[PDB]
């Protein structure tokens, strides 16, 4: 299915895996929890190279990503091009990088409009729906894992922690600021993917990172209780780096996120309902 690269090819096309940033003149575009993403050129096509605690489960996570990517092909899913059994995964380059970096206007990029943010939220929901319809749990839904293409179309990436589908594990893994309570207790369920998406919806509305050490509150999901406790409303948190936001659409998106962030897992909506509510918001 995929093209087995060789380490030297990637070493060549990524400039000795230059850890310098793209702006200065390097090839490093970002990092995750299990590797660093480098920019490369194969044929004449631009590619992203992910060069990946426990060495054998790193290799299982390598295999899992290929395992899931071979059976998962959707408009709102990233595309894997090849691999290299240091371990490496080659993807199609996303011209607009990550939703996290664009919400931050990293490297001087212009702020996302509310119209673009709405399309991004719908696309990411369509991707999660495709995964849940194929009985897959991502286990790391976050804005740094939602990438944006040449049309700012949302694409979910990093399927290395994905699992098939309630069960429990001994290896709790994820990004704490996005995880539902049952996921932090060790449960494995698609209902945790919904909760993480709700955090993403809050980052899209507010433009704030999920966790900031030098901020009150430090956790974004805690603004739901402040609004619920009549202290604030969603309009006190709307990203001010927008000129096309209306109160109805934003309050519509907040209601979806609030439903997704229900502390009880069985009260959250399924991803299909999330798709429905996000489409009614624009139609
Ligand atoms: C694991 O770590 C992260 O995904 N960290 C998040 C980090 C890496 C991400 N940036 C990128 C990721 C990908 C990409 C394409 C497929 C895949 C697949 C995976 C996987 N799995 C990861 N990335 N990826 N293409 C391009 C970029 C990028 O910067 N373009 C420049 C652009 F932003 C701009 C505006 C011109 O500056 C931020």
Q: How was this structure determined?
A: X-ray
CA 189 to chain centroid, in Å, comes to: 17
> What is the Cα–Cα distance from 249 to 238, expressed in whole angstroms?
11
Contact present, 204 and 120 (Cβ < 8 Å): yes
Backbone angles phi, psi at 156, to 5 degrees: -85, 135
Q: What b-and-e string marks burial along 71-91, b requiring 16 or more CB atoms within 10 Å of the CB?
A: ebebebbbebbbbbeebbbbb
Cα dihedral 243, 244, 248, 251, rounded to 10, equals -60
CA-CA distance, 280 to 263, in Å (whole number)? 25
What does the block give as tokens for 155? 């694409």
Q: Is-contact 56 62, C-beta < 8 A?
A: no
DSSP secondary structure string, the chain?
--EE--HHHHHHHTTTT--SBTTTT--EEEE-SS-EEEEEEETTEEEEEEE---HHHHHHHHHHHHHHHHH---TTB--EEEEE---EEEEE--TT-BHHHHHTTGGGPPPPPHHHHHHHHHHHHHHHHHHHHTTEE-S---GGGEEE-TT--EEE---TT-EE--EE-SS--S-GGG--HHHHHTEE-HHHHHHHHHHHHHHHHH---SB-TTSSSSBGGGHHHHHHTTS--GGGTS-SS-SS--HHHHHHHHHHHHHHT-SSGGGSPPHHHHHHHHHHHH-
Query: Which sequence positions are flagged as catalytic?
Result: 140
With a 6 Å cutoff on the Cβ, whether 144 touches ligand 1 is yes
| Two domains, one topology: 3-92 and 99-282 | no
Contact 282, 118 (CB under 8 A): yes
Best mutation site among 26, 30, 80, 144 for ligand 1 pocket (most ligand atoms within 8 Å of CB): 30
Q: Can you give the residue ranges of every domain in the chain?
A: 3-92, 99-282
Name the resolution in angstroms: 2.3
Using alpha carbons, select from 145, 242, 149 the residue that is nearest to residue 197: 145
**Is 200 annotated as belonging to a binding site?**
no
Q: State how far the Cα of 96 lies from the Cα of 148, in Å rounded to an integer.
A: 5
CATH class of the structural domain 99-282:
mainly alpha
How far CA 2 is from CA of 17, 48, 59, 89, in Å, comes to: 22, 15, 17, 10
CATH 3.30.200.20 fits 3-92, yes or no: yes
End-to-end CA distance of the chain: 39
């Amino acid at each position: 299915r995929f093209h087995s690269f060789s380490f030297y090819e990637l070493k060549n096309v990524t400039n000795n895996f230059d850890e310098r940033p793209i702006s200065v003149g390097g090839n490093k575009m970002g990092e995750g929890g299990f590797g660093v993403v480098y920019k490369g050129y194969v044929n004449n096509t631009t590619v992203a190279v992910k060069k990946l605690i426990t060495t054998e489960e790193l290799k299982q996570q390598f295999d899992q990503e290929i395992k899931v990517m071979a059976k998962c092909q959707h408009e709102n899913l990233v595309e894997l091009l090849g691999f290299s059994s240091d371990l490496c995964l080659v993807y199609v380059y996303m011209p607009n990088g990550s939703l996290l970096d664009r919400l931050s206007c990293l490297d001087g990029t212009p702020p996302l409009s509310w119209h673009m943010r709405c399309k991004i939220a719908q696309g990411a929901a369509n991707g999660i729906n495709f995964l849940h319809e194929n009985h897959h749990i991502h286990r790391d839904i976050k804005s740094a894992n939602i990438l944006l293409d040449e049309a700012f179309t949302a694409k979910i990436s990093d399927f290395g922690l994905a699992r098939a589908s309630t069960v429990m594990t001994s290896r709790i893994v994820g990004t704490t600021a996005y995880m539902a309570p049952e996921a932090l207790r060790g449960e494995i369920t698609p209902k945790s993917d919904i909760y993480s998406f709700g955090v993403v919806l809050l980052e899209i509305i507010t433009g704030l990172p999920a966790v900031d050490e030098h901020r009150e509150p430090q956790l974004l999901l805690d603004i739901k209780e402040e609004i619920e406790d009549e202290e604030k409303t969603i309009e006190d948190y709307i990203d001010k780096k927008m000129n096309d936001a209306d109160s109805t659409s934003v309050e519509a998106m907040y209601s979806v996120a609030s439903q997704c962030l229900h502390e009880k897992k069985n009260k959250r909506p399924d991803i299909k309902k999330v798709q429905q509510l996000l489409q009614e918001m624009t139609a």
